Every structure is written in C-alpha cells, then in structure tokens.
Amino acid sequence: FXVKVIG
Amino acid sequence: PPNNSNAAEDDLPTVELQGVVPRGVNLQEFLNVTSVHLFKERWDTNKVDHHTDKYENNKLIVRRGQSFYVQIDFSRPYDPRRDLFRVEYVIGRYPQENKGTYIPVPIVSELQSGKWGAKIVMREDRSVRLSIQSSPKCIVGKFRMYVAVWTPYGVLRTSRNPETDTYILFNPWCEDDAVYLDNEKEREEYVLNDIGVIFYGEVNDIKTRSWSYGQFEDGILDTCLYVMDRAQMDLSGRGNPIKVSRVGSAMVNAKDDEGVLVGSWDNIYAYGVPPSAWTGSVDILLEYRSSENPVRYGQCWVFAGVFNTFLRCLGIPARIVTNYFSAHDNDANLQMDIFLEEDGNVNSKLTKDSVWNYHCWNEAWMTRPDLPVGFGGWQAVDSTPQENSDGMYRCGPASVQAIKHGHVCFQFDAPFVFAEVNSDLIYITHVVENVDATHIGKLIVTKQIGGDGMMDITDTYKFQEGQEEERLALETALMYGSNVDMDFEVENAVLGKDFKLSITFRNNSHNRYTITAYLSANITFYTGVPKAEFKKETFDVTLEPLSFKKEAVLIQAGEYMGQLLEQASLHFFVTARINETRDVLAKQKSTVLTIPEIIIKVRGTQVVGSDMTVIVEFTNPLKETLRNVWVHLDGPGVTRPMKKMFREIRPNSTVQWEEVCRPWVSGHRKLIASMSSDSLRHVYGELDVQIQ
Ligand SMILES: [Ca+2]
Ligand SMILES: [Ca+2]
Ligand SMILES: [Ca+2]
Incomplete structure (x- = not known):
C-alpha cells in the first residue's frame, strides 16, 4: 500500500 | 466577459444584412452551400494521417498545424471572378479574432507556412476540394465550422450544423508544435498507447499494476474539454500546453475547484470506490462527467492514471513516473525535518514532513518558451494534493532539467519537486543528531517503450548519489530556495x-x-x-x-x-x-x-545527358592555417562522388574547385559538399538543383 515510512 | 467554456456557443447570423437593404433584393446571384463533406470516416486519410482514427468520436478530429481535406458543394460552380468566400472556425460564447477564438480561413493560391489558409486542390462540377491548414499554435478544443459567402449586402453564412463540428488537438508530429516529439516510437508510446503499467511497492520489492488510460474511448475527449470548462480556463490559453498541463494538475484533484478525484488514505473509504478497486481512468472520468461531481476515491497512482489520460487525450505526450522514498516538504526549506524525542522515537507532534514508500506523478512533454533555452522537454506535473502552489493544490510544470541542476528558481513548483527526489533527511532532537543524504529518491522509474519492463530514469532528475555534482546541485537548489x-x-x-x-x-x-x-x-x-x-x-x-x-x-x-x-x-x-x-x-x-560556409554554384544548363560545371567555394574562417583540406562533392543523381585536396589554406583565404558533372536522373536532385582538415572537420554545404 502507499504509506508514510518516516514522519 | 470571459470566454472560458468550450460547450457554450453563440448564434451566428445566416443572412447578415448591413445597412438599410432595399426590399426585393435578389440574393440568387450569390453562391450558397448545398453540402459540406469532411471525409471524417476513421479509415480515411484525414484521421489516419492525423493519428486520430482511434477515437470513437464520429466527428472530424485533426491535429493543429497540419493539412486536412474538405469538400464544399455550391449551388453553381464557384467562380473567383464573381465569388468570394471563406471558412470560419468558432469556439465559445464570445469569439474574438484577436484572441484566436474566431478563425477566418481565407481561400489562398498557395498555403503559407504556419498560417491558417485553405487551398482549392480539385474542382468537379459544383464542388471544390479544399486543403485546409491550421496554425501550429491553434487553440485546442471543439470548433464550430461555417462557410461564409461575401456579398455587397453583407455575409451569407451556413446554418449551425453539429455534424461539421471539428476537434483540433495538439500535434506531437508537427515540428512547429510546442509538443513536437521527433521520435516515432516515443510518439506511439506517449500519445497513442491507451494501456500502461504503473510501478509501486518498495525499492527491493517492485510491483506492477496495469492501467487502462483509455483516452480514445467514447466520451473521454469530451470529458477532458468539460474539465477545462469546469476549471473556467480561458479558451485563448488552451493552445498552450504549459497552461493546459497546469490546469490539469489542479483539476484532477477535488480540492479548491470541484475536480475529478477525492483523495483518501483512511482505510475505510465511506460511500465510494476504494482506491485499489479502479483499474483505469474511464469509469472515473465518465462518472465525473455524468455526476458533475468529484468521484470517490483515489490515491497517488489513480491521480496519475487520470492525469495521464487527460494529457494523452489532448495530444500532449505524457508518462507516469514512480519515485521510491518520496519526500513531502511541508515548510519549503527543501529538507526533511524529522524531530525525535530524547527517547529515540519520532516525535509525531513536531514532525510535519514525511517520506513515503513511493509516490507517482506525471511528466508532460513540451517546449518551455517562458524559460531560457535548454529547459524544455520532460516537465514534472503532479495532480496529487500535497502543497499549495499560488493558492491551489497543483504542481508544475517543473522542468526536469532545471531540477537536475538545482535551478529551482524557474517556474512552476521546481523547489517542491526537487525536495521530492533529493531532499536531505535531517534528524533533530534542538541538537541535530544525524543526516541521511542518500535515502530520498533512491530510484525513479517509468514503463519502457514497447514493453512492460521498467525504465530507470533516476539520472534525469538528479546526479548519482555520492558524486560531487549531486552536492553542488543540491546546494544550488537550496541557495535559490x-x-x-x-x-x-x-x-x-x-x-x-x-x-x-x-x-x-x-x-x-x-x-x-x-x-x-x-x-x-x-x-x-x-x-x-x-x-x-x-x-x-x-x-x-x-x-x-x-x-x-x-x-x-x-x-x-x-x-x-x-x-x-x-x-x-x-x-x-x-x-x-x-x-x-x-x-x-x-x-x-x-x-x-x-x-x-560552403557555397555551391552551378554553371551550364542542368539537363540529363549534357555536361554542367559545379563550383564549390570555401573560405577559411579561422585566424589559423588549415592543412590537408579534403573537399568532397556528393550528388546522387548528378555526380559520382569526387574529392579535391588542398595541402594548405591560409587564414581568411578562399579556394575554389570546379568539377565537370553529367546528370543521369532527371528531376529534383541535390548536391552536397563536405570539408575536413587536420583541425576543422565535417563542415557541409548543400544546393538543390533541378535537372531536366
Ligand atoms: Ca483541484
Ligand atoms: Ca522541510
Ligand atoms: Ca541525495
């Protein structure tokens, strides 16, 4: 899936 | 009053009388049109040669700056000694000639380069076949066609006829067009391919997703026009692919302007289609057009899929690029500000920037006359809402070549895109604890030409990590801001x-x-x-x-x-x-x-089977002397190839070479000269010659 990987 | 709707139209008079015309005037003297033919079938030369035969639309579709054939039938044979007529193309409710939205097309002897005109190429009984040429800067849209016959009492014009409505698109095949793309394989892939592949996943686990762009399916071209109508985009700017791609950047997302797609990442997707359900752009655009409301829901690749359709439909060449580890700058200082608690976990209150496992956007191909030379070609455009650009969620066109060298001062939104592909990660606790200069933008890819494989295009956005240029260009981007x-x-x-x-x-x-x-x-x-x-x-x-x-x-x-x-x-x-x-x-x-320069002259009559003389002249353009100067003469139908050598040509000196030729192929032939020496090499001259 499109996800935040930092912050 | 703004002329910003292609769907709106005005009524043009059919009998446009002027002054106080006496009763009993006899208009039978003047031509009237009995029939217009556009040869608009999808097997015929107009649509095939204009590369528009794939659209399902049954109207004529042509690309700007290129000739197409029509045929007008009159009540009697057209006679230029007594008759004068023109063709008119009209778009919008308030057409004006000086805005390019009323286009008179004169009947001319010879078509002129880059100018609207129409040439009579055949005459049979009461009909005339016309070759019509459009300007390569023409507004892109759906035009109403009219035939206007001029009389001493005013104009006599054909009636509104929806069957002669004519679409004029961007032309990647016309070299005077701002979207010219001189490579046929790239035109096939970036304009005419209605199926694509979109890359996602993570760098070491790359996944692929099919996508039906469907720019040729019934209703899709009309929807793209409706999108620009919905944006209230002035018609006169719609021939500029910089304005068309920046309007599209804003209108594909629902923020600010009732655009196509509502974004959502909340894992629930109440009252809508969840983003991973879509497999193409058509159902989104057709639902947008019939509902006249935003469609729920999308994420980055869906925004890009629909943006790609909009661009390719209109004739701007376009592709979707995937960026792995993509940075979203929130405070426009061009670096990722990541705040950690003393414990070591990321403080989620102070941290507003973020980087994503991947992100997708579009590149649109165009000249950039608003930027210095060297910055045209691929322009990054992004329709995923991220940051406001001059008051709306939109992004670009940003020149990919300007981003590479960090010249982010050139419009539009080049700082943000640079931060997406090469920002530094700055871990702050306020004591800066670490810097990661290699993580952001690890890999940028797009579908290869003619296959479903991956094309690595990272080097177009950034120099290779670790090289001094990658640092110097980033410090440039920072200094510009x-x-x-x-x-x-x-x-x-x-x-x-x-x-x-x-x-x-x-x-x-x-x-x-x-x-x-x-x-x-x-x-x-x-x-x-x-x-x-x-x-x-x-x-x-x-x-x-x-x-x-x-x-x-x-x-x-x-x-x-x-x-x-x-x-x-x-x-x-x-x-x-x-x-x-x-x-x-x-x-x-x-x-x-x-x-x-190499001047080529010919002396003697130029007839197949008699001798004529070719004179090749050359001037040394340098303040130095040229040694071992070989001059060559090539003339496919005129001469077998020939050479003269000069051991030395002094500065600013001129040598002359006379050569006896005897042509054996009559017609339009050509002479070519070449010069190479020890220093100056591979300089040429050319001359076209007519041989009887
Ligand atoms: Ca929008
Ligand atoms: Ca920042
Ligand atoms: Ca870097």
Missing part, C-alpha cells in the same frame, strides 16, 4: 573545431579561498528542448586574495560533433562552491556555434 564574482564565456566557438570555455573568478576580499565546482556541457535543440550532456567535469581551484583568475576548459570537437543537429545550440551549467564560506555561485548560458 564571500565577495567572489564568477562568470564564464566561450571563446570564438566554430562548428567543427575544438574550443575553450573560460570560467573567471574575481576575489575582491583580502582572503584566500578554495573553490570546488562542476561543469555540464549539453547539446540542445533549436526550440530549447535538451538533447544530451556531452561533457561533464568537476574541478578544484585556489583563489588568491585580491585577484582575477581564469580557468580554461578545452572542449574537443570529438566530444560534441557526434550529437549535433540543424540549428542545435550548446547549453552550459557551471556551479562553484566557495569552500571556506559554503557560498555557491551558479550560472547557465547558451551559445550558437559559428557555422563555416
């Missing part, structure tokens, strides 16, 4: 010889400085589209106090002579860092090469 002056100039640069690049430094302070710099030398098309980098150097230089210093860079002929084309120019980037102060000085300049 020591008392040392830097300039450069290229000394007398003649096509076919080496030349020197002169970078000068002026140090007005009392300090000694160390400088680190790079040099990028590039070949560019005449329209300003980049072609290739042919030389790249990093160098170090020490700068004594109160001094001028020149660093001379030799560009050998072999480095650039293999990648030239007509009217191509050279584009240079120089960026120096003053090491002691971290100050950065950046410049970009273009130059045109001096072209030596």
Whole structure:
C-alpha cells in the first residue's frame, strides 16, 4: 500500500 | 466577459444584412452551400494521417498545424471572378479574432507556412476540394465550422450544423508544435498507447499494476474539454500546453475547484470506490462527467492514471513516473525535518514532513518558451494534493532539467519537486543528531517503450548519489530556495573545431579561498528542448586574495560533433562552491556555434545527358592555417562522388574547385559538399538543383 515510512 | 467554456456557443447570423437593404433584393446571384463533406470516416486519410482514427468520436478530429481535406458543394460552380468566400472556425460564447477564438480561413493560391489558409486542390462540377491548414499554435478544443459567402449586402453564412463540428488537438508530429516529439516510437508510446503499467511497492520489492488510460474511448475527449470548462480556463490559453498541463494538475484533484478525484488514505473509504478497486481512468472520468461531481476515491497512482489520460487525450505526450522514498516538504526549506524525542522515537507532534514508500506523478512533454533555452522537454506535473502552489493544490510544470541542476528558481513548483527526489533527511532532537543524504529518491522509474519492463530514469532528475555534482546541485537548489564574482564565456566557438570555455573568478576580499565546482556541457535543440550532456567535469581551484583568475576548459570537437543537429545550440551549467564560506555561485548560458560556409554554384544548363560545371567555394574562417583540406562533392543523381585536396589554406583565404558533372536522373536532385582538415572537420554545404 502507499504509506508514510518516516514522519 | 470571459470566454472560458468550450460547450457554450453563440448564434451566428445566416443572412447578415448591413445597412438599410432595399426590399426585393435578389440574393440568387450569390453562391450558397448545398453540402459540406469532411471525409471524417476513421479509415480515411484525414484521421489516419492525423493519428486520430482511434477515437470513437464520429466527428472530424485533426491535429493543429497540419493539412486536412474538405469538400464544399455550391449551388453553381464557384467562380473567383464573381465569388468570394471563406471558412470560419468558432469556439465559445464570445469569439474574438484577436484572441484566436474566431478563425477566418481565407481561400489562398498557395498555403503559407504556419498560417491558417485553405487551398482549392480539385474542382468537379459544383464542388471544390479544399486543403485546409491550421496554425501550429491553434487553440485546442471543439470548433464550430461555417462557410461564409461575401456579398455587397453583407455575409451569407451556413446554418449551425453539429455534424461539421471539428476537434483540433495538439500535434506531437508537427515540428512547429510546442509538443513536437521527433521520435516515432516515443510518439506511439506517449500519445497513442491507451494501456500502461504503473510501478509501486518498495525499492527491493517492485510491483506492477496495469492501467487502462483509455483516452480514445467514447466520451473521454469530451470529458477532458468539460474539465477545462469546469476549471473556467480561458479558451485563448488552451493552445498552450504549459497552461493546459497546469490546469490539469489542479483539476484532477477535488480540492479548491470541484475536480475529478477525492483523495483518501483512511482505510475505510465511506460511500465510494476504494482506491485499489479502479483499474483505469474511464469509469472515473465518465462518472465525473455524468455526476458533475468529484468521484470517490483515489490515491497517488489513480491521480496519475487520470492525469495521464487527460494529457494523452489532448495530444500532449505524457508518462507516469514512480519515485521510491518520496519526500513531502511541508515548510519549503527543501529538507526533511524529522524531530525525535530524547527517547529515540519520532516525535509525531513536531514532525510535519514525511517520506513515503513511493509516490507517482506525471511528466508532460513540451517546449518551455517562458524559460531560457535548454529547459524544455520532460516537465514534472503532479495532480496529487500535497502543497499549495499560488493558492491551489497543483504542481508544475517543473522542468526536469532545471531540477537536475538545482535551478529551482524557474517556474512552476521546481523547489517542491526537487525536495521530492533529493531532499536531505535531517534528524533533530534542538541538537541535530544525524543526516541521511542518500535515502530520498533512491530510484525513479517509468514503463519502457514497447514493453512492460521498467525504465530507470533516476539520472534525469538528479546526479548519482555520492558524486560531487549531486552536492553542488543540491546546494544550488537550496541557495535559490564571500565577495567572489564568477562568470564564464566561450571563446570564438566554430562548428567543427575544438574550443575553450573560460570560467573567471574575481576575489575582491583580502582572503584566500578554495573553490570546488562542476561543469555540464549539453547539446540542445533549436526550440530549447535538451538533447544530451556531452561533457561533464568537476574541478578544484585556489583563489588568491585580491585577484582575477581564469580557468580554461578545452572542449574537443570529438566530444560534441557526434550529437549535433540543424540549428542545435550548446547549453552550459557551471556551479562553484566557495569552500571556506559554503557560498555557491551558479550560472547557465547558451551559445550558437559559428557555422563555416560552403557555397555551391552551378554553371551550364542542368539537363540529363549534357555536361554542367559545379563550383564549390570555401573560405577559411579561422585566424589559423588549415592543412590537408579534403573537399568532397556528393550528388546522387548528378555526380559520382569526387574529392579535391588542398595541402594548405591560409587564414581568411578562399579556394575554389570546379568539377565537370553529367546528370543521369532527371528531376529534383541535390548536391552536397563536405570539408575536413587536420583541425576543422565535417563542415557541409548543400544546393538543390533541378535537372531536366
Ligand atoms: Ca483541484
Ligand atoms: Ca522541510
Ligand atoms: Ca541525495
């Protein structure tokens, strides 16, 4: 899936 | 009053009488139209030659700046001694000629380059076949067609006829077009392919997703026009693919303007289609057009899929790029601000920037006449809402070549896109604990031409991690957002010889400085589209106090002579860092090469089977002497190839070579001359000759 990987 | 709707139309008079016309006027003297034929079937030469035969639409569809055939039938044979008529193309509710939305098309003897006109090419009984030529800067949209017959009492015009409505699109095949794309395979993939592949996943686990762009399906072209109508985009700007791609960037998302797609990442997707359910763009656009409301829901690849359809439908070549580890800058300082708690976990309150496992956007292909030469070609455009650009969620067109060198001052939104592909990760606790310079933008890809494989295009956005240029370009991007002056100039640069690049430094302070710099030398098309980098150097230089210093860079002929084309120019980037102060000085300049001339004259009659004389003249253009000058003469139908050698040609001296020829192929033939010597090489001249 499109996800935040930092912050 | 704004003329900003293609769907709106005005009523044009059919009997446009002027003054006080007496009763009993007899208009039977004048032509009237009985029938208009556009040869609009999808097997016929108009749609096939204009590459529009794939659209399901049954109206005529043509691309601007290219000829198409129509045929007008009159009540009697057209007679230019008594008759005068014109064709008119009209778009919008308030057409004006000086805005390009009322286009008169005169009947002309010969078509003129780049100008609207129509030429009579055949006459049979009461009909005339017309070759009509549109301007390559024409507004893109759906036009109403009219035939206007002129009389002493005013104009007599055909009735509104929806069957002659005519679509005019962008033309990647026309070389006067701002979207010209000189490679046929790239036109097939970036315009005519309605199926694509979109990459996602993570860098070491790359996944692929099919996508039906469907720009040719019934209703899709009309929807793209409706999108621009929904944006209230002025019709007169719709022939500019910079304005069309920036409007599309805003209108594909629902923020600000009732655009196509509502974004959502909340894992629930109440009252809508969840983003991973879509497999193409058509159901979104057709639902947007019938509902006249935003469609729920999308994420980055869905925004890009729909954006790609909009662009390819209108004839702007476009592709979708996937960026792995994509940074979203929230405070426009061009770096990822990540705040950690003393514990070590990411403080989620102070941290507003973020980086994503991947992100997708579009590139649109166009010239950039609003930027210096060298910045055309692929432009990044993003329809995923991320940051406001001048008050709306939109992004670009940002020149990919301007991003590479960090010249982010050039519009539009180039700082943000640069931060997406190469920002530094700055971990702050406020004590800065670590910096990661290699994580953001690890890999940028797009579907390869003619297959479903991955094309790695990272090097188009950024230099390779670890190289000094990657640092210098980033410091440039940051500076744009020591008392040392830097300039450069290229000394007398003649096509076919080496030349020197002169970078000068002026140090007005009392300090000694160390400088680190790079040099990028590039070949560019005449329209300003980049072609290739042919030389790249990093160098170090020490700068004594109160001094001028020149660093001379030799560009050998072999480095650039293999990648030239007509009217191509050279584009240079120089960026120096003053090491002691971290100050950065950046410049970009273009130059045109001096072209030596070779005049070819012919003396005698030019008839197949009698002797004529060719005279090749050449002037040494240098302040130096040329040795072992071989001159060559090629003439496919006129002469077997021939050579003359000159051991020496003095400076500014002129030699002449007379050659006896006897042509054996009558028609339009051509003579070509070449010159190569020890220094200046591969200079040419040409002459067209008519042979009887
Ligand atoms: Ca929007
Ligand atoms: Ca930031
Ligand atoms: Ca980097």
